[PDB]
Ligand binder design. Structure first.
Ligand SMILES: CC(C)C[C@H](NC(=O)[C@@H](N)CCCC[NH3+])C(=O)O
Ligand SMILES: CC(C)C[C@H](NC(=O)[C@@H](N)CCCC[NH3+])C(=O)O
Lengths: 486, 486
């Protein structure tokens, strides 16, 4: 022990940061379709798409800022400051007293009659995305540096609870904050994540007195020679060009898991959801963020079992000693869950032809089938086993396979390739929606999937995941042969 | 080279042996339901079940005979002699001139009116099964001993063409011999496999002059001490008790692949099969052995591609150096094929509700769907990739992981555990047919599956295969750690 405070402070900072981030993405589309904006669905979705795109693209640049110029701690503080500065825009816009201060004074109430307060919300989204980008690429290596002098097992044990805190903040946001934004006063609904950001900044500032920081290395990126003589700078390029194919093969894995995360909630919208006695009935409604947290809850339950039972057994039996093998196991569980979801959708698509029941979730009617929502339990347990096997392993791999000088930059490139996979998954979803292929071609997301073929999409995702699993297993052997052999 | 004749003779012997064996099992049920016997379907199926059971149970005993008493070459010759002696019973029974010599003189022609010539056919089946049992357990180690002094790569290359010859004899039997037994004169239909057995015996006798044999070791099994001091006899037990869990975990793999081999042909019976111009039309009919060889043809096509392209690349890239990893890859392909077959059956079960077409294969009407048989091409290509990855690897593993003194016995135990898996698969098929579970509960095999749920059975087989794949991958690491480390 001894360094328990330096880890707890980073865990709390990441928890609050993820809570605020999943608060801004849980009801942003519904907020843009409201009194102050009255935007259309296309632009409302494009706003969140550009937000996540800036978050993914900005992430590497945040690592370069934390490595070449700043010390990866002042970088986190500055990024959290820019994050908090952009967080006030949403409560200031939702408040009628300050909506006049932001831009004009929004008159449109029933959306009877092209964007209002566009620069304000766009600057807020840009600053929030850049803040999340610079934080996520610098919070995992700086957090793992607190226990780096104890061995890789300490970093893995820390990353376990790091992921656990990320999906306890996500549950606290999607469960509590989103329900507040959906049914009760909205100004406080957006003010709570801002308070979370402020508390995270304060916690990091107080924890700076016990953190073990590293001085910046400015003359590290200028020595990326590409024409072929100081030493220890050649190895930083040899250890960098060898980890690129791993991320390239992980891109389609991100594609499959992001499309699965979207389509799983989309399918959960079309199942029989039980009514909470007096929480989702009149005059309130059930938020969709709970259907989204249906998999963070399982992860939160699962992680303590892996850290206490699975990891010691696998360590004392010599099973899965490297992170790449755990990533392969996670991808196998991902394709298994995709096949299970395809089976469940094939069974569900036969029930909607006979009888459909109407349910209201997002103040909209969904024609669900006569099938309990708890039938998604196996398909969610499988992705729960996969993320605790693939995501934590990928994080500790990006932390360990990176050079000592370039860590935040490599983590930012990891998140950027994850975002590239997400965009490839969006393009794949748009590809199967053409007139040639009738799979998922009724309308855009959050609609009616009774006329679509989601089981075929799940089977295609499973086949793709299996192919990229074989590819990753092929390239994993070619990479582990240079870790302790060459 | 230099030893090309000693390998070609064993390949031809195995080819003819497998051809005769797959000739006796292609139309045995239809033969027992005919003029000389007029048996019922239950006893006709029980006869083949007991035949295969004696084949599987007898296999280890054949290895003990080839190791403790005989020299594994005289054992093969004696087993082939007993095989040929039991092969004459079927042509002698089918011939009207000798049917009176066998037992009485069978009068029942239209089966108007409890077994006729029961001792004759039972003794023939018993002797043929014991012959196949003693041959299969002694033909692979004796055949692999011709190239054992060149390295494991030579044994793997030999086993490739060994499997290729096994499924070229199977095609020559199911394609040519079964079509002769189905439409044209039946006496010659059963006399052809007997000629094949005689030719195999003659070929082995002529090739005995170039085979490299091993003297028998009688004092090898008496030293299986189980209470706990000559050396090299303790290692023979340590290398024997360690390979038992591998076979125990391979048992459910055999269960899944035997049930798949049965249900794949059963599903192929319910698809649109094109008519050969003047081969399957009046007055002839399409044999089911061709629908069964639909996967041996693909294997025959695939094997030369693996021996010439896949193996050199995997060798020069350090990929899959052990047989257990290839077995795991084969099991992964098996579960992938099971999922694909489940998808295809889910698509097929929706077409039979609208329109069904009638087709005659075994002189019986099948209500097939309006779906081409060539849609089974992916599900058969996957099992083709699996067998060339799992079966050859399992054979070379049973040959290499066995002690030098006990090889045929270990191969016989391998085939016995395969048969145990087959019987477990039969019990599993009988388990899902209870009144509680409506999966495959219309009737016995070779019937109507339009009222059954074969897609659910395929999904269950896929889940079981994945579970046993994870188990095998877990136990594979615990076994490879004592090959070159301990
Ligand atoms: C791999 C990264 C990009 C994703 C990771 N996701 C989670 O932690 C989820 N378990 C949270 C669930 C909320 C929506 N389904 C992350 O948070 O960074
Ligand atoms: C693993 C052993 C027991 C099976 C093996 N099977 C084959 O070779 C098939 N490819 C033959 C196909 C004919 C019926 N589908 C064997 O022959 O021993």
């Amino acid at each position: 022990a001894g360094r328990r405070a330096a880890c707890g402070a980073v865990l709390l900072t990441e928890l609050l940061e993820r809570a605020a981030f999943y608060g801004i993405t849980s009801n942003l589309v519904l907020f843009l379709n409201g009194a102050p904006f009255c935007w259309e669905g296309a632009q409302a979705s494009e706003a969140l798409l550009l937000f996540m795109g800036l978050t993914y693209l900005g992430s590497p640049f945040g690592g370069w800022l934390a490595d070449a110029r700043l010390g990866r701690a002042r970088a986190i503080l500055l990024s959290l400051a820019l994050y908090l500065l952009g967080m006030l825009a949403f409560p200031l816009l939702a408040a009628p007293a300050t909506r006049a201060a932001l831009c004009g004074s929004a008159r449109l109430l029933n959306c009877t009659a092209a964007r209002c307060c566009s620069p304000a919300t766009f600057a807020g989204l840009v600053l929030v995305g850049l803040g999340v980008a610079t934080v996520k690429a610098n919070i995992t290596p700086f957090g793992a540096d607190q226990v780096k002098d104890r061995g890789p097992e300490a970093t893995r044990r820390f990353f376990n609870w790091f992921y656990w805190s990320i999906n306890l903040g996500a549950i606290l946001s999607l469960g509590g904050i989103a329900y507040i934004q959906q049914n009760v006063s909205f100004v406080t609904g957006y003010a709570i994540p801002t308070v979370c950001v402020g508390l995270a900044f304060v916690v990091f500032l107080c924890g700076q007195s016990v953190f073990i920081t590293k001085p910046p290395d400015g003359s590290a990126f200028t020595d990326m020679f590409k024409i072929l003589f100081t030493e220890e700078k050649v190895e930083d390029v040899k250890a960098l060009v060898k980890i690129v194919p791993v991320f390239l093969a992980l891109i389609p894995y991100w594609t499959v898991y992001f499309q699965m995360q979207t389509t799983y909630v989309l399918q959960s919208l079309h199942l029989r959801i039980p009514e909470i006695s007096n929480i989702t009935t009149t005059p309130h409604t059930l938020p969709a963020a709970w259907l989204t947290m249906f998999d963070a809850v399982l992860i939160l339950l699962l992680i303590p079992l892996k850290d206490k039972l699975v990891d010691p057994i696998l360590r004392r039996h010599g099973l899965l000693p490297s992170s790449l093998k755990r990533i392969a196991v996670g991808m196998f569980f991902v394709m298994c869950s995709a096949f299970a979801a395809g089976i469940l959708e094939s069974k569900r698509l036969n029930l909607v032809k006979e009888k459909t029941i109407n349910q209201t979730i997002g103040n909209v009617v969904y024609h669900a089938a006569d099938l309990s929502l708890w039938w998604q339990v196996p398909q969610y347990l499988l992705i729960g086993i996969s993320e605790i096997f693939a995501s934590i392993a990928g994080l500790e791999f990006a932390y360990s396979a990176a050079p000592k000088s370039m860590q935040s930059a490599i983590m930012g490139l990891f998140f950027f390739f994850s975002g590239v996979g997400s965009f490839v998954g969006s393009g794949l979803l748009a590809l199967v929606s053409i007139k040639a292929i009738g799979w998922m071609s009724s309308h855009t997301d959050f609609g009616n999937i009774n006329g679509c073929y989601l089981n075929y999409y799940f089977f295609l995702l499973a086949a793709i995941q299996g192919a990229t699993l074989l590819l990753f297993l092929i390239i994993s052997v070619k990479y582990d042969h240079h870790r302790d052999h060459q």
